[PDB]
Design a protein around this ligand. Structure first.
Ligand SMILES: Cn1cnc(Cn2c(=O)nc(Nc3cc4cn(C)nc4cc3Cl)n(Cc3cc(F)c(F)cc3F)c2=O)n1
Ligand SMILES: Cn1cnc(Cn2c(=O)nc(Nc3cc4cn(C)nc4cc3Cl)n(Cc3cc(F)c(F)cc3F)c2=O)n1
Lengths: 304, 304
């Protein structure tokens, strides 16, 4: 009962966060086994940030230029290498708190938990989604560079995001853990613009199901639509088109609830055209698109 | 930049969660030093839950009736005692992962993070507020009894909530860690009703400040009101009355923003009377009342 923006427990990640300083530039890094992963922007002095030549800056550095602090313990840098936009600092000590992990790239519309960190120190946890324009609507202040996003699958942490920068619109941009940006951005301190964002339709439908599971039923009706008639309406309102694979993903919720996907699509059509008229769904007055079908199952049926 | 429902990192609590079984009844408990704290409802068999006589049930038990599992490790119960609605199971091993901690009772309107647990296993983290009617709007399934709420002050975990039960309306009720209920509830499986809830006015004002800090300014105006004129309007709309101490708490946000509290109160007056007319604030179409003034400072200025 109830429905909240729920993050994954963050303890397994917290013991991996460290602080990385290179001269007067400092940010967060991720310590797994005997490697520390962090944004390569850390080798920039303030003069280099606008237009860095990262290959040039890196060859001018040595291992002792890199200060890595894990709490009070200092870690000895014994090697360094660049992989796309991340720096890999080999250290002399393997992190005894290394969880089982993997590096995965997520798709637009998927959700993950962020551990926001400052000076190597975990500060807070929240859930967000990768937007279709490859930015996230995070909550980050100065000093959060290197903070990570992750999911938990049983025992295993899947890292999927490393925070790099803020865009002029206030949204955030970053890379996967192999250093490849999400979206068309580059790691330099310039004004870069995001493409126009759209609403994640399958998620809105997942959330309507969650509402029906929690006793909000006022928006349902008899009608059924077809994919094509729906998608014609979706596009007018800046919603991602719906596919057959989307419909199939919503299968478990369809079953548990007794409402066909195309049945629920007709309700969504109505909500889009007529609005909500001061009514709320799951305590919201807007259609919420940052819960996936898996988030709903996890919170309305049970997974630990 | 950005604004999210942010929870505290949960790692320090996660290593304290255990599973407590007494016959066929099972729930979560909190292992600190050599004590395990859990809801006393665990000594009820299914027949006892409607109208337990807890003093009777407890004397009929012995230490070996209590199965406590910390992951795979079983803990040896060497003593038991009841304190109001919580059971204290003394065990033979002190939890090596015990953080610095304290037990504090929170006031209505304050916020805290919940670690929702099942079978002793941490499942998710979210932030919520204690409502003025002493319930919380949580997200909990069967098996979450004993889950805890907490805050973090530097190094120190302040535990403030132990989850007991769900009410017919879908909201949740629990105790502090000394076993005293929040609100007029009792730990038995009967239908109990909550008092009528109200909106936490000081929090709504804290959130309007957060919006101004993040560039949402459309709702501001010239007018100033007085406490008395505002409180006259607040009460018509089921808002908690505002006090001088509330005004003082909003001091830091007033300063950082250049907008007097009574200035912001006039905007809130307008929003209450005219509504928002399809505009949003911080991505919400409702006035949000579950961020305290301290939550806003923490997320818009910086505290780790
Ligand atoms: C407001 N906000 C929201 N998210 C962010 C993230 N972020 C950040 O934390 N820091 C950045 N630049 C740095 C300045 C430094 C000054 N010192 C002493 N050390 C510093 C280290 C960093 Cl990383 N930036 C900007 C930024 C970071 C990049 F990694 C990048 F490739 C381009 C950029 F423009 C930043 O966005 N701040
Ligand atoms: C849907 N929901 C939302 N929150 C809750 C919390 N909660 C819970 O998890 N369990 C409860 N009763 C139990 C049944 C058991 C069956 N077995 C085998 N073991 C059990 C243990 C418990 Cl605790 N309840 C009900 C409940 C729990 C109390 F602690 C109480 F004092 C009165 C109550 F009515 C419950 O609300 N479920």
């Amino acid at each position: 009962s109830g429905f909240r923006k729920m993050a994954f427990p963050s303890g397994k990640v917290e013991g991996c966060m460290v602080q990385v300083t290179c001269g007067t530039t400092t940010l967060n890094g991720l310590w797994l086994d005997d490697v520390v992963y962090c944004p390569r922007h850390v080798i920039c002095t303030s003069e280099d940030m606008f237009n860095p030549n990262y290959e040039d800056l890196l060859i001018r550095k040595s291992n002792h230029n890199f200060l890595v602090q894990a709490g009070n313990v200092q870690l000895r840098v014994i090697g360094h290498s660049m992989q796309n936009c991340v720096l890999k600092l080999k250290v002399d000590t393997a992190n005894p708190k290394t969880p089982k992990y993997k590096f995965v790239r997520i798709q637009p519309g998927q959700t993950f938990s962020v551990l926001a960190c400052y000076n190597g120190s975990p500060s807070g946890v929240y859930q967000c989604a990768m937007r279709p324009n490859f930015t996230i609507k995070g909550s980050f202040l100065n000093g959060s560079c290197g903070s990570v996003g992750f999911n938990i699958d049983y025992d295993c942490v899947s890292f999927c995001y490393m925070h790099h920068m803020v865009l002029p619109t206030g949204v955030h941009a970053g890379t996967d853990l192999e250093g490849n940006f999400y979206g068309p951005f580059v790691d330099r301190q310039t004004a870069q613009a995001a493409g126009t964002d759209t609403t994640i339709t399958v998620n809105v439908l997942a959330w309507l199901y969650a509402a029906v599971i929690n006793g909000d039923r006022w928006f349902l009706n008899r009608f059924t639509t077809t994919l094509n008639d729906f998608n014609l309406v979706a596009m007018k309102y800046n919603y991602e088109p719906l596919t057959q694979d989307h419909v199939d993903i919503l299968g478990p919720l369809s079953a548990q609830t007794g409402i066909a996907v195309l049945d629920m699509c007709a309700s969504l059509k109505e909500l889009l055209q007529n609005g909500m008229n001061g009514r709320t769904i799951l305590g919201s007055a807007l259609l919420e698109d940052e819960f996936t079908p898996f988030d709903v199952v996890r919170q309305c049926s049970g997974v630990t």
